[PDB]
Structures are given as C-alpha cells and as structure tokens.
A paper describes a structure:
2 exhibited dose-dependent tethering and partial noncompetitive allosteric inhibition of [name] with a tethering EC50 of 7.8 ± 1.1 µM and a Ki for pNPP activity of 7.1 ± 1.1 µM (maximum inhibition of ~60%). To futher validate that 2 acts specifically through the K197 site and to explore the mechanism of inhibition by 2, we solved a high-resolution (1.95 Å) crystal structure of [name] tethered with 2. The structure confirms that 2 tethers to [name] rather than to the active-site catalytic Cys215, and also that tethered 2 resides in the 197 site rather than in the relatively nearby BB site, which is also theoretically within reach of the tethering linker on the other side of the α3 helix. Additionally, 2 packs against the hydrophobic floor, centered on Leu172, of the relatively shallow binding pocket in the 197 site. Thus, although the mechanistic details remain unclear, allosteric inhibition by 2 may involve conformational changes, especially of α3, that are similar to those that occur during the global transition from the open to the closed state.
[name] is highly validated as a therapeutic target for diabetes and cancer and has also been linked to Rett syndrome. Transition of this loop from the open to the closed state is rate-limiting for catalysis. By exploiting a new multitemperature multiconformer X-ray approach, we have identified a collective allosteric network that is contiguous on the ‘back side’ of the protein, centered around the quasi-ordered α7 helix.
Residue numbers in the entry: 1 to 285
Write the structure that this text describes.
Amino acid sequence: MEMEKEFEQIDKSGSWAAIYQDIRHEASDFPSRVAKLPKNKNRNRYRDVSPFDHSRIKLHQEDNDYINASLIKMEEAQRSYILTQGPLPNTVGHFWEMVWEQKSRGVVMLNRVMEKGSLKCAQYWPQKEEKEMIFEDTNLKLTLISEDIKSYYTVRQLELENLTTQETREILHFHYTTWPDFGVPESPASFLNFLFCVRESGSLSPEHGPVVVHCSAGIGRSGTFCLADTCLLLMDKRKDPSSVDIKKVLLEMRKFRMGLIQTADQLRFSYLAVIEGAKFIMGDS
Ligand SMILES: *SCC(=O)Nc1cc(-c2ccc(F)cc2F)ccc1O
C-alpha cells in the first residue's frame, strides 16, 4: 500500500516533524473576519482558532449568527462534516441550535470535559434521564434517552425538542472517552472501532445533515477523525486505492477550517489509522 511504505519511509527517517511543517506552510489561509469581531470574542474558546468566513456555519437567528464552527465539504468522498470547538458555557444553546438547524443526526465528541485539570468544554448534554436541559436563549430542550458505556467510548441517545414547534429529533452522541491527556493512542484500534460505530449508526450518511465533530479546539483530534474517515471512504471509492494521498486530503480539508491536525504526532497517528482501517475495509469478513 502506497502510504504504508511512505509511512515506514517517514518513520525510519524521523521525518514526521518535517512533513507536518510542510503541511502547515502549504495550508490555505482565508479570512476569519466574523470570528474576530469584538462582539464575538466570548464565542471563541481560543483566540488563534477561528472558522474561515467562507465555510463558517451561520446560526439562523441572524441576530448574532456567529458560531465557531466550519463546514468541511469533501466532494469526491461525498462526505460533509461540521467541525466546531467544544461548546462554551455561554454557547451551549448555540451549539444545539446549530445541530437542529443543520439537521445533524450525530455529534462526535473526542475529548473529556476536563483534561489536564482544566475544562475543555461545557457539560453540554444531560447526565441523567430525569434531569433534562432547557436552553432558554434558543428555545430547545435536550433529554438523555439512553446511554451505552463501553470500554473506550460511550454512545448516547438524546432527544432534542424544538420548543417553539414541538418537533423532536433523536441525536446520537458518540463520545470517545479514552484519548490520552498527552500524545495520541498507542494503537489506532479503539479509534477505528469508534469511527466504525459512528458510520454504522447512519449518522454520516447523506440523508442527514453533516455530523457535528468536536474536541476542545475542534481541529486536532477532530481533524484526525474526519481525515481518517474521508481517506478510508476514498480508498473504497477509487479504482486504485493507493492513489489516495492523506497529505492532499488534509490540505483539502484545511481549505475549510484552519489547523486540522495539531501535532506531527497526530499526523503520524492519522496515517496509522488509515493504513490499519484500510485492512479492515479493503477486504476481510
Ligand atoms: S456502535 C454503532 C451504533 O449505532 N451504536 C448505537 C446505536 C444506537 C441507535 C439508536 C437509535 C437508532 F435509531 C439507531 C441506532 F443505531 C443506540 C446505541 C448505540 O450504542
């Protein structure tokens, strides 16, 4: 497999930091003017992580339509994702408004609420069936329906109700709970099993809105999730799978949101996940 030996080549030569930096200098730069408006300073978790204006998701409350969220559109793979930051205490209502307005079926969470002794995002869904959440700014109600805790991740069924119309939708929440505080997982196995769980749920499918994917900044682990998903999808779609160049896919995704894949270590891990996930989809059972 092309990338498999390109992987060994990079590894043996300890070249990850050099490839990753070539990616950073090749990466697109587009304006992020809405994100920088003073009125939006507290809608951003990080000052240096902003959605591009061209791809940003707009809340349909036109009032302030801003949310730190980007639409990543992968045209050949026919996949779309919304990558967003972990919601802030003051943007949880916006997050669920986005989920509602974009008709998303799944939310993918790749971080824990607290990591490294700091809060990486707000507790934005209910932890008990009987204790639902009501977001009064956006007129939404969110109920925990069911929770399936597994060794490496948790899947939850949620009910999102639009209070103004009394329509309800079921949202699936896929929470990868075991990414390490430092570095990347030692093996990609649990991450792929997580990815295939999201796929199996139907959440990534074109009949629904884009899956909403987040970590804390919405670029690192979140970038790794989408990048692997799209590369594997392309390797199945193309006549020759070895024509799939992960670096090119990354650069295409970076046209939609800055900074995807934060460290050379995440890049290496992304390669590893795609190579291993290939074995599970280009054959086998
Ligand atoms: S790990 C793959 C997966 O789909 N897991 C999972 C799915 C669901 C669910 C609920 C409702 C529905 F209409 C479809 C569906 F797949 C619930 C829990 C769970 O772990």
